[PDB]
């Protein structure tokens, strides 16, 4: 199943949401990650230059996919096919951003 | 502030996730609405032919827009700017449903 991460949208987007999928990819229960940046799941490898397209595209609101090393609470690295993308009021205010892991089998 | 909520895709897309603006709205806690349809939110003056394009966007995972009459937990009526849209993986798999309130002034 596709994991997903639903963020506040201001500040250093904390985690207010995670799905049931998100934590059997992960090992994270809600109650570890929940008020954090998401950026908790990278470590090591992660691609810095991959990191950087991320904090741009966050940072303009701008919808974003990228395949990124992340880790699980177990320290065992796992590709993660992310897509984010911002929430939207009808004035265009950004209410959150979602975030997706897409199960690629 | 703009109200958000967050549903599972599948079977009668129970509530998974609301945003404090949410609750500041409805007057609604999250325990009192998670694991429900939405549709709590309707009462007698609704329009019928309202909630029948909601149903049908919704079934297609079609984005919608729509001005409803709602209401709080006290019962008093309020107009919910209502837009919602699908949450695809990038399979095209609907993976939830985001509804957001539009805080118009
Ligand atoms: C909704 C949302 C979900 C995110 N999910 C992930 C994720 O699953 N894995 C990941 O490495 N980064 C994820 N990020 C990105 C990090 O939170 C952060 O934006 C990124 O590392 C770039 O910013 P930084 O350079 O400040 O860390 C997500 C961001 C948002 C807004
Ligand atoms: C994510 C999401 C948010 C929704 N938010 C509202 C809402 O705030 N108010 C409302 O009247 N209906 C809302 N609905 C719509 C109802 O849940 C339902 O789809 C609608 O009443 C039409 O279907 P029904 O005829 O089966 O009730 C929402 C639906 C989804 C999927």
Same mark, same amino acid.
């Given at each position: 199943?596709? &994991?997903? #991460? @639903?963020?506040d949208? &201001?500040?250093?987007?904390?985690?207010?949401? @995670? %799905?049931?999928?998100?934590?059997? #990819? $992960? &090992?994270?229960?809600?109650? *570890?990650?929940?008020?954090?940046?998401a950026? /908790?799941?990278q470590?090591?490898?992660?691609?810095?230059? $991959?990191?950087?397209?991320?904090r *741009?595209?966050?940072?303009?609101?701008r919808?974003?996919? *990228?395949?990124?090393?992340?880790?699980?609470?177990?320290?065992?690295? /796992?590709?993660?096919?992310?897509? #984010?993308?911002?929430v939207?009021? *009808?004035?265009? %205010? @950004?209410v959150?951003? @979602?975030?997706?892991?897409?199960?690629?089998?």
């Open positions: 199943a596709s &994991g997903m #991460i @639903v963020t949208a &201001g500040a250093d987007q904390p985690i207010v949401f @995670v %799905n049931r999928a998100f934590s059997t #990819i $992960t &090992g994270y229960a809600p109650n *570890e990650v929940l008020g954090r940046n950026r /908790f799941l470590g090591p490898q992660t691609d810095a230059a $991959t990191v950087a397209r991320l *741009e595209a966050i940072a303009a609101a919808p974003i996919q *990228e395949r990124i090393l992340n880790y699980r609470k177990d320290g065992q690295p /796992f590709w993660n096919q992310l897509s #984010i993308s911002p939207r009021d *009808e004035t265009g %205010n @950004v959150a951003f @979602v975030g997706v892991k897409t199960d690629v089998t």
